[PDB]
């Protein structure tokens, strides 16, 4: 550990933007659409769409862990604490060569294969007061989730029920104990944000996460169900996360696509409610892959040599 006190701000961390831009370029030479459409305006309202048609090679895009080592004239500083807001003065900081192996998983609503919370479930937010700022949840115990191009994902109803609890409890432990915690599905928006979207085998899965976010701080949902089955769908025409615009990928082909990932975290986003009675409603969120990266770099910060 480094014997000094420094400031950290994962919400304004620059490595996030440095990885994000990398992960995008890690996408332009691995997953290339058959056609990519992107807004093109002079400002005069009228906006032509810039079209691009390239080969559409079916590649089973399988993410490789990524390290981030400071070159020279630069040093990475890691924060150490069982519960770090990731936005303030860190006491147990410590210089490191490369950040832990991170598997740049691009997804929405659920953070897959990320890094678990050592102690307990932690939830960071650039401002919990602002019903506009994504709440990044960090699970201390991942929940396996298996998706298949066959059309769905299975999740443990047990583990997911617990998780919502040990999350619902960490929420009120920030918005007011004497406050009811509820979970509802997406409010609306793009398919990629409304469902738990992500990529598996180069196939863009779109799983309906209603059964994962319709939890009332009162009842249950395990009648005749041992596992939660999200009705997933693979799309060819998708909205790009790298930049405003659609992109069409070629249909599936491999006799079988399969994924078994660790739900290591979520991206929630409680609704304003305009100071109404203690009844905070949290819904799935994300779509801004940087929050993802953040959830992984929340305790890092590269700095110039002295």
């Amino acid at each position: 550990l480094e014997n000094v006190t420094e400031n950290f701000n994962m919400w304004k961390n620059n490595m996030v933007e440095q990885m994000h831009e990398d992960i995008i370029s890690l996408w332009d030479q691995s997953l290339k659409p058959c056609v990519k459409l992107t807004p093109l305006c002079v400002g005069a309202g009228s906006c032509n769409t810039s079209v691009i048609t390239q080969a559409c090679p079916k590649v089973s895009f399988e993410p490789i862990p990524i390290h981030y080592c400071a070159p020279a004239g630069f040093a990475i500083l890691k924060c150490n604490d069982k519960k770090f807001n990731g936005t303030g003065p860190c006491t147990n900081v410590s210089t490191v060569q490369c950040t832990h192996g991170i598997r740049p998983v691009v997804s929405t609503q659920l953070l897959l294969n990320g890094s678990l919370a050592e102690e307990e479930i932690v939830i960071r937010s650039e401002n919990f007061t602002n019903n506009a700022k994504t709440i990044i949840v960090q699970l201390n115990e991942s929940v396996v989730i298996n998706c298949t191009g066959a059309g769905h994902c299975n999740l443990s109803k047990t583990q997911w029920e617990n998780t919502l609890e040990q999350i619902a409890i960490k929420l009120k432990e920030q918005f007011g104990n004497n406050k009811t915690i509820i979970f509802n599905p997406s409010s609306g928006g793009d398919p990629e944000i409304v469902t738990h979207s992500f990529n598996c085998g180069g196939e863009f899965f779109y799983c309906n996460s209603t059964q994962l976010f319709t939890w009332n701080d009162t009842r249950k949902l395990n009648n005749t169900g041992r596992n939660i089955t999200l009705p997933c769908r693979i799309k060819q025409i998708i909205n790009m996360w790298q930049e405003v615009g659609k992109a069409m990928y070629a249909p599936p082909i491999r006799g079988q696509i399969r994924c078994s990932s660790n739900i290591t975290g979520l991206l929630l986003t409680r609704d304003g409610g305009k100071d109404t009675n203690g009844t905070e409603i949290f819904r799935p969120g994300g779509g801004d892959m940087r929050d993802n990266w953040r959830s992984e770099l929340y305790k890092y910060k590269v700095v110039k040599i002295e």
């Binding site: 058959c34 048609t53 080969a55 559409c56 070629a250």
Partner: protein, 214 residues
């Protein structure tokens, strides 16, 4: 840049029998190959696609075979209605640059029938027009192969004339050529005898049918 060649430019075969068509491709087109069927004067008909899968509502006699650069639309007991030109479509490259085969006529092969040449002189009314048109019909015959020659005053002159075969018929299933030597007024009057020599395969020997102005 993909070239799709349908080797059998023409395939003469009889009803009930088995007809085979072969589409040859430049580079590999994998399995993105379809087959079409076109009746004279009709929009094509999607028979097979993806190389070996028949389109919804299509006779099982049509067999789609192949993969790579060698496809085959083989047909078991060919049918009366199965007469048409067949086309293969390549649609595997991307960007989209689909190409079609050049075709194959699935004509009915029958008995070698000789042509009955009818030479028709240019109606005076038509001659009053300013030109003359000598029509040398060739009724009902088979192998569409029928070389015709226009001899003006026993002159092998071969130029101002234009043929026109008809499609395969229904009942007879024969063809009918139609060569037309269109001369002037001052040159039609400048020549005496106008003969039309038909040299068909089913003709024991050349058959010249002509006429003298009058």
């Amino acid at each position: 840049d993909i070239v799709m060649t349908q080797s059998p430019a023409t395939l003469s075969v009889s009803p009930g029998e088995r007809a085979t068509l072969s589409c040859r491709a430049s580079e590999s087109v994998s399995s993105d190959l379809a087959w079409y069927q076109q009746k004279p004067g009709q929009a094509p008909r999607l028979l097979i696609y993806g190389a070996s899968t028949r389109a919804t509502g299509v006779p099982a006699r049509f067999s789609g075979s192949g993969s790579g650069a060698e496809f085959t639309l083989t047909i078991s007991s060919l049918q009366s209605e199965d007469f048409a030109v067949y086309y293969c479509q390549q649609y595997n490259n991307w960007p989209p640059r689909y190409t079609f085969g050049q075709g194959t006529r699935l004509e009915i092969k029958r008995t070698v029938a000789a042509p009955s040449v009818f030479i028709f002189p240019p109606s005076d009314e038509q001659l009053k027009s300013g030109t003359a048109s000598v029509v040398c019909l060739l009724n009902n015959f088979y192998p569409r192969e029928a070389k015709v020659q226009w001899k003006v005053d026993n002159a092998l002159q071969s130029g101002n004339s234009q043929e026109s075969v008809t499609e395969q018929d229904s009942k007879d299933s024969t063809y009918s050529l139609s060569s037309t030597l269109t001369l002037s007024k001052a040159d039609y009057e400048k020549h005496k005898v106008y003969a039309c020599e038909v040299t068909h395969q089913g003709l024991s020997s050349p058959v010249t049918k002509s006429f003298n102005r009058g």
